[PDB]
C-alpha cells in the first residue's frame, strides 16, 4: 500500500468523493447515533491535510499524553499536499501533486508556523543551496509563450519572455529575456495590436487621468483587469487574449475575473503611469522535491514515528513510509485513511463522530474535535450548526485546478527550443514547465537532457468572458471536470505537448513515459473578490463561518479564505487554542 507511486487519475481520485457527494448532492444523511461507540480519543480531527495534521501536532504539544484520531477520505494523507513518484532509468523521479512551495516564508510565516518548521527540522536557509537557481538559466533556457492556431491563426512559440511573475524562482538578471519590442514583435498579432502592446510597456499613460488616487483605487477594485485593458488602456479584443490565462495558475481565475487592483498588486502591466501608491520579491525557492507533501510527511513521521525512520528535512525526502503503521490500535496518534466523516455532534461534554469506510458506518468519540476538512463540507457533518453559520460555511466555494505530472523520456526538445517553461494564453494547460531543479537529502534533480525528466503543467477549467461571478466559474469548472474521463484528460495533455514541442522532434507516443493527473476539483479556498463581494459582509461571513461550536472547532485554510499552507497552519493553531 503506497499511494505516491500510483499514476493516472489521482488528486481527488475515484473512491475519495462518493460518500461526500451522497451527502452534498443527494442529501442523504448517515446517522450513527444508533451505533455503539467503538473508540474514544482526546481529539478527533476530520480531514488529514496540512491543517488537520497541524491541529494534531499542536494539540499534542499542549497535551503530550493526548490520544488523537485523524479521519481522512483520500487514500493518502496530506490533502492538497501530495507526493507523486515516477520510476525511470532505475531511479525515482519526484513530483508534487498539489501544494507546491512555501510562499515567501520569511515575510509571511507566523511565529507559530516558524515554530512548527523548527521543531520538524526545516531550515529555510538550506533552500538557498538546495534549489539549483542557476541550472536552467545557465543552460541558456528562457520562458516562452505559446500561441495556438485556434485563437491566433497559427501555432507559434515565442521565447525570451521578460514578464515578471508573482512567485518567480528565476532571478531577474537570469531571465535570458529579450526586449519588449523584440519579444512582442514576434507575436502572431496584427501590426496595430503589436504596437499597442509595445506602447503598453514603452509609453505608459495615465489611463484614469482626472481621478484622484482614491477614485482610481475604487475604480480598479470594481473593474476587472480585462475590462481595464479593454476600456481604459484601449487594447483590442484580440490583444487582450494574450493576458487571458496568465493569472490562471496562481489565482485559479482569468483576467476577466480578477479585479484590476489585484492585477496591479501582482505586477501586471498597465499601471505604471496611474500614480498609484506602493503595494513578489522573495525568491520562490522554498521547494521540497515533492512540494509541500514534505511538510505533511514531516508531521506524520513526527506524530507516528513507526511510519518511517529519520529526523530532519534531509532524510524525509527519500524516507520509506510504511502505511500499515498509520492506524495501529494503542498508538496514541492514529491516521485513518479512506474514511469519510458523516456526522459530528456535541454530547455529554464531548463529541461523537461518525465516519464511513469501505461502505460501512462507524462511531467514535472525542473529548474535542477539530474540523479541518473543506469548510463547505462542514454543514453536512456538524449537526449543531445554526442555519446562519451553515450558510456562511457554504459560501466558501473552492476553486478547481488540475496539476498534471508528465514523465518525459528526455528533454532534448526543450533544449533545442531554448525553453524551460511555457505560458499558453488560451489552451487548457496555461502553464507547462520543466520541474524545479532541487537537490535535497539523497535526491538529485535530473540534469542530462538525454535522460528522463518530470514536467509540470497546470489546467484550470475557467469559463472566461461569460458574465459569471467567481463562485459560479468555480462551480461550473467542477461540472466540466466531472464530465471528463481520464482518457479525455490524457488526450488534452498529449495534444498540447505535441503541438508545442513537436516542431523540435517531440513525438508524444514515444517520448511520454508517464502521466499523473492530480484533479483538485475542490482546490484553492475561496477568496474575497472585490468584483463580486462586499468586503465588510465577507469579513463578517468568514468570521461567523469559523465560530467554535461547543467542543467542535473549525479549521482548514478555507477558514481564513486564504489558500496557503501557512494559513492552514494558522487556522489549525487558532482551532487548537479555542479548545
367-394: b (≥16 Cβ within 10 Å) or e: bbbbbbbbbbbbbbbbbebeeebeebbb
Which one, 73 or 159, has the nearer CB to ligand HEM? 73
Q: Which three cell numbers stand for residue 304?
A: 507516528
Cβ proximity to ligand FAD, 101 vs 463, nearer residue: 101
Query: Percent helix, strand and coil across the chain, each rounded to 5?
Result: 35, 20, 40
Distance CA(375)–CA(473), nearest Å, equals 19
CB 472 to ligand HEM: min, Å: 10
- Answer with the entry of ligand FAD, ligand HEM, none that 478 interacts with (C-beta below 5 to 8 A by kind): ligand HEM
The annotation status of 96 as a binding-site residue, yes or no, is no
Write down the least CB distance from residue 100 to ligand FAD, Å. 3
Q: Which residues bind ligand HEM (CB under 6 A)?
A: 12, 16-17, 20-21, 24, 73, 374, 376-377, 380, 394, 397, 475, 478-479, 481-482, 519, 521-522
Contacts of 130 (CB under 8 A, 6+ apart): 438, 439, 440
Residue 386 among known ligand-binding residues? no
In the bound state with ligand FAD, the residue whose beta carbon lies nearer, of 270 and 454, is 454
Angle between helices 50-62 and 565-578 (to 10 degrees): 40
Phi, psi of 39 (to 5 degrees): -150, 150
Rounded distance, CA 46 to CA 373, Å? 6
Residue 88 CB, nearest approach to ligand HEM (Å): 27
248 annotated as a binding-site residue? no
72 vs 421 by CB, closer to ligand HEM:
72
Q: Are 70 and 334 in contact (CB under 8 A)?
A: yes
CB 96 within 8 A of CB 290: yes
Contact partner at residue 81 from ligand FAD, ligand HEM, none, CB < 5 to 8 Å by partner kind: ligand FAD
Q: How far is the CB of 274 from ligand HEM (least distance, A)?
A: 36
- Compute the residue count for the chain: 579
- CA–CA dist 376, 578 (Å, integer): 21
Which residue, among 515, 482, 489, has the nearest Cα to 400 in the 3D structure? 482
Is 371 or 531 the residue whose CB approaches ligand FAD more closely?
371
The answer on whether 80 is annotated among ligand-binding residues is: yes
Distance CA 223, CA 243 (A): 15
Whether 478 has a binding-site annotation, put simply, is yes
237 is in an annotated binding site: no
Residue 24 interacts with, from ligand HEM, ligand FAD, none (CB under 5-8 Å by kind): ligand HEM
In whole angstroms, give the CA distance from residue 281 to residue 20: 40
Q: Is 104 annotated as a binding residue?
A: no
522 is in an annotated binding site: yes
143 annotated as a binding-site residue: no
Neighbours of 27 (CB within 10 A): 8
Distance CA 319, CA 293 (A): 13
Taking the complex as a whole, the smallest distance from the CB of residue 21 to ligand FAD amounts, in Å, to 11
Q: 482 contacts which partner out of ligand FAD, ligand HEM, none, CB within 5 to 8 A by kind?
A: ligand HEM
Q: State the residue for C-alpha cell 492506524.
A: 327
Residue 72 contacts which entry, ligand FAD, ligand HEM, none (Cβ below 5-8 A, type-dependent)? ligand FAD
For ligand HEM, give the closer residue by CB, 27 or 320. 27
Residue 220 interacting partner from ligand HEM, ligand FAD, none (CB closer than 5 to 8 Å by kind): none
Cβ-based nearer residue to ligand HEM, 15 or 171: 15
Task: Kindly tell me which of 152 and 526 has the beta carbon lying closer to ligand HEM.
Answer: 526
| 430 appears as a binding residue in the annotation | no
Does 73 carry a binding-site annotation? yes
Could you tell which of ligand HEM, ligand FAD, none binds residue 376, using a CB distance below 5 to 8 A set by kind? ligand HEM
Query: What's the rounded Cα separation, in Å, for the pair 449 and 2?
Result: 29
- Residue 360, beta-bridge partner list: 357
Q: Nearest residue to ligand HEM, using CB?
A: 24
CB of 46 to ligand HEM, least distance (A): 10
The closest of 45, 74, 94 to 333, measured between CA atoms, is: 45
- Are residues 122 and 316 in contact, defined by beta-carbon separation less than 8 angstroms? no
CA distances (Å), 345 to each of 354, 359, 553, 555, in order? 9, 21, 12, 17
d(CA 395, CA 391): 6
Q: Which is nearer to ligand FAD, 46 or 184 (CB)?
A: 46
Enumerate binding residues for ligand FAD (CB under 6 A): 20, 46-52, 71-74, 79-81, 98-101, 103, 292, 340-341, 372-374, 377, 381, 401, 403, 520, 523-524, 556-557, 563-565, 568
What sign has the CA pseudo-torsion 359, 365, 366, 369? Answer: positive
For residue 21, say whether it is annotated as part of any ligand binding site: yes
| Residue 496 contacts which entry, ligand HEM, ligand FAD, none (Cβ below 5-8 A, type-dependent) | none
CA dihedral (155, 157, 161, 163) in degrees, to 10, reads 30
Q: How far is the CB of 212 from ligand FAD (least distance, A)?
A: 36
- CB closer to ligand FAD out of 139 and 265: 265
Q: Where are the alpha helices (DSSP H) in 343-382?
A: 378-381
Question: Is 565 annotated as belonging to a binding site?
Answer: yes
Using the minimum distance from each CB to ligand FAD, give the nearer residue, 224 or 294: 294
What is the rounded CA–CA span in Å between residue 287 and residue 127? 7
**Partner from ligand HEM, ligand FAD, none binding residue 414, C-beta < 5-8 Å depending on class:** none
Residue 257 is labelled as binding a ligand: no
If you search the block for the grid coordinates 492556431, which residue do you land on? 149
Q: With CB cut-offs between 5 and 8 Å by kind, which of ligand FAD, ligand HEM, none does residue 479 bind?
A: ligand HEM
What torsion, rounded to 10 degrees, do the Cα atoms 249, 253, 257, 261 define? -40
Judge whether 377 is annotated as a binding position: yes
In the bound complex, what is the minimum distance in angstroms from residue 470's beta carbon to ligand HEM?
12
What cell numbers appear for 521 in the block? 476539483
Q: Which residues are annotated as a binding site for FAD?
A: 51, 72-74, 80, 99-101, 341, 377, 556-557, 565
Q: Which residues are annotated as a binding site?
A: 21, 51, 72-74, 80, 99-101, 341, 377, 380, 478, 522, 556-557, 565
Q: Which residues are annotated as a binding site for heme b?
A: 21, 380, 478, 522
Amino acid at each position: 500500500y503506497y499511494p505516491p507511486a500510483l499514476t493516472g487519475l489521482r488528486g481527488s481520485h475515484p473512491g475519495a468523493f462518493e460518500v461526500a457527494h451522497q451527502m452534498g448532492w443527494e442529501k442523504k444523511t448517515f446517522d450513527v447515533d444508533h451505533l455503539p461507540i467503538e473508540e474514544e480519543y482526546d481529539l478527533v480531527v476530520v480531514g488529514g491535510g496540512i491543517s488537520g495534521l497541524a491541529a494534531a501536532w499542536f494539540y499534542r504539544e499542549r497535551h503530550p499524553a493526548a490520544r488523537i484520531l485523524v479521519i481522512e477520505n483520500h487514500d493518502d494523507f496530506g490533502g492538497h499536499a501530495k507526493r507523486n513518484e515516477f520510476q525511470a532509468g532505475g531511479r525515482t523521479i519526484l513530483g508534487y501533486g498539489g501544494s507546491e512551495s512555501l510562499q515567501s516564508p520569511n515575510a509571511l510565516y507566523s511565529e507559530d508556523a516558524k515554530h512548527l518548521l523548527k521543531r520538524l527540522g526545516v531550515e529555510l536557509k538550506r533552500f538557498e543551496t538546495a534549489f539549483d537557481t542557476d541550472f536552467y538559466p545557465g543552460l541558456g533556457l528562457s520562458r516562452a509563450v505559446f500561441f495556438d492556431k485556434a485563437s491566433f491563426g497559427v501555432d507559434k512559440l515565442v521565447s525570451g519572455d521578460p514578464t515578471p511573475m508573482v512567485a518567480d524562482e528565476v532571478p531577474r538578471d537570469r531571465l535570458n529575456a529579450r526586449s519588449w519590442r523584440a519579444f512582442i514583435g514576434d507575436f502572431p498579432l496584427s501590426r496595430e495590436d503589436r504596437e499597442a502592446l509595445i506602447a503598453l510597456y514603452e509609453s505608459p499613460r495615465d489611463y484614469l487621468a482626472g481621478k484622484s488616487v482614491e477614485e482610481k483605487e475604487t475604480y480598479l477594485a470594481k473593474t476587472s483587469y480585462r475590462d481595464y485593458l479593454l476600456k481604459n488602456v484601449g487594447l483590442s479584443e484580440t490583444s487582450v487574449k494574450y493576458f487571458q490565462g496568465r493569472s490562471n495558475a496562481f489565482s485559479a481565475l482569468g483576467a476577466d475575473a480578477l479585479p484590476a487592483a489585484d492585477a496591479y498588486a501582482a505586477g501586471f502591466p498597465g499601471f505604471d503611469a496611474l500614480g498609484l501608491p506602493q503595494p513578489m520579491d522573495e525568491p520562490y525557492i522554498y521547494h521540497f522535491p515533492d512540494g509541500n507533501a514534505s511538510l505533511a510527511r514531516l508531521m506524520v513521521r513526527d506524530l507516528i514515528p513507526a511510519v518511517a525512520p529519520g529526523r530532519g528535512m534531509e532524510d524525509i525526502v527519500m524516507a520509506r513510509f510504511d502505511y500499515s503503521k498509520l492506524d495501529l490500535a494503542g498508538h496514541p496518534v492514529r491516521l485513518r485513511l479512506n474514511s469519510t466523516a458523516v456526522s459530528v455532534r456535541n454530547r455529554a461534554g464531548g463529541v461523537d463522530v461518525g465516519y464511513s469506510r469501505a461502505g460501512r458506518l462507524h462511531r467514535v468519540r472525542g473529548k474535542h474535535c477539530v474540523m479541518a476538512c473543506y469548510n463547505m463540507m462542514v454543514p453536512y457533518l456538524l449537526r449543531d450548526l445554526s442555519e446562519e453559520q451553515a450558510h456562511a460555511l457554504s459560501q466558501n466555494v473552492k476553486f478547481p485546478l488540475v496539476y498534471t505530472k508528465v514523465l518525459l523520456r528526455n528533454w532534448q526538445a526543450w533544449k533545442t527550443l531554448g525553453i524551460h517553461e511555457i505560458y499558453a494564453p488560451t489552451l487548457p494547460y496555461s502553464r507547462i514547465k520543466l520541474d524545479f531543479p532541487v537537490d535535497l537529502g539523497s535526491y538529485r534533480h535530473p540534469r542530462d537532457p538525454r535522460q528522463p525528466i518530470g514536467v509540470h503543467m497546470v489546467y484550470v477549467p475557467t469559463t472566461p468572458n461569460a458574465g459569471m461571478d467567481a463562485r459560479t466559474q468555480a462551480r461550473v469548472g467542477r461540472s466540466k471536470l466531472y464530465a471528463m474521463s481520464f482518457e479525455q484528460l490524457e488526450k488534452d495533455i498529449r495534444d498540447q505537448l505535441q503541438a508545442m514541442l513537436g516542431p523540435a522532434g517531440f513525438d508524444h507516443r514515444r517520448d511520454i513515459t508517464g502521466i499523473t493527473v492530480n484533479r483538485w476539483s475542490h482546490g484553492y479556498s475561496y477568496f474575497m473578490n472585490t468584483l463580486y463581494d462586499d468586503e465588510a459582509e465577507s469579513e463578517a461571513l468568514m468570521e461567523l463561518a469559523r465560530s467554535k461550536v461547543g467542543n467542535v472547532a473549525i479549521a482548514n485554510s478555507d477558514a481564513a479564505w486564504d489558500a496557503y499552507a501557512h494559513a492552514a497552519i494558522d487556522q489549525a493553531v487558532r482551532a487548537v487554542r479555542e479548545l
